[PDB]
């Protein structure tokens, strides 16, 4: 069922037969990662590596002790040696804690994985700190988003995503600590 066991090493060996021999092996995305999933370790007690990423940033890469992730069933939390997870996130607040101090990033959604070696990779598109959103434009936009309700299920699905993201943004901005 897995009769083509590829990899960098197999492609190196087969690629020395069909390409001309003077060409060095093309690099692979594996060659710039020292961290894997099945490579056990990287745990060290209470704090775990939280690779909070973004297409246009890297928001965090140091080790944290508890992460609140806004999955599509609801908000869940990750402690150190958590179960492996591939969690799709709804638009909500990813809370990074190192102790008493909490930094609250409101994200746009996008997946968040927990691997067997305890590394967690939050992977969202637009991941803003909740400081830089205004509380005025959200209901100002949701009043229009509750109006244009067409039969076009493309536009209606965009309206559903609009009212759900805007409602989660509102419910996260009135409920500050």
């Amino acid at each position: 069922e897995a009769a083509a066991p590829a990899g960098p090493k197999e492609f190196t060996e087969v690629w020395n037969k069909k390409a001309p021999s003077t060409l060095i092996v093309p690099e692979f995305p594996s060659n710039y990662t020292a961290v894997k999933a099945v490579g056990e370790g990287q745990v060290h007690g209470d704090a775990f590596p939280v690779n909070f990423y973004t297409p246009h940033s890297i928001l965090s890469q140091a080790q944290k002790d508890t992460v609140v992730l806004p999955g599509v069933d609801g908000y869940f939390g990750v402690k150190a040696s958590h179960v492996p997870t591939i969690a799709q996130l709804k638009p909500g607040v990813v809370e990074l804690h190192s102790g008493a101090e909490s930094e609250k990033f409101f994200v746009s959604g996008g997946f968040a994985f927990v691997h067997p070696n305890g590394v967690t990779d939050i992977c969202v598109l637009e991941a803003a700190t909740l400081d830089q959103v205004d509380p005025a434009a959200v209901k100002s936009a949701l009043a229009a988003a509750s109006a244009a309700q067409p039969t076009d299920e493309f536009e209606q699905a965009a309206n559903r995503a609009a009212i759900e993201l805007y409602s989660a943004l509102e419910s996260a901005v009135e409920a500050k600590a």
Partner: protein, 53 residues
Amino acid sequence: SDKGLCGGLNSNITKYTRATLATTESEGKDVVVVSIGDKGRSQLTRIESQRYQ
């Protein structure tokens, strides 16, 4: 790339295109080739023209 004074970058990619595209060939697999950048549009057609989309 789009502009052209890059100096053999796009040609090195055009040769690794076929160097990695012949190492796929084991059973007569279908291949679509696609180029991002204007200087790949002119260079893959010399080598793979029917598989360009």
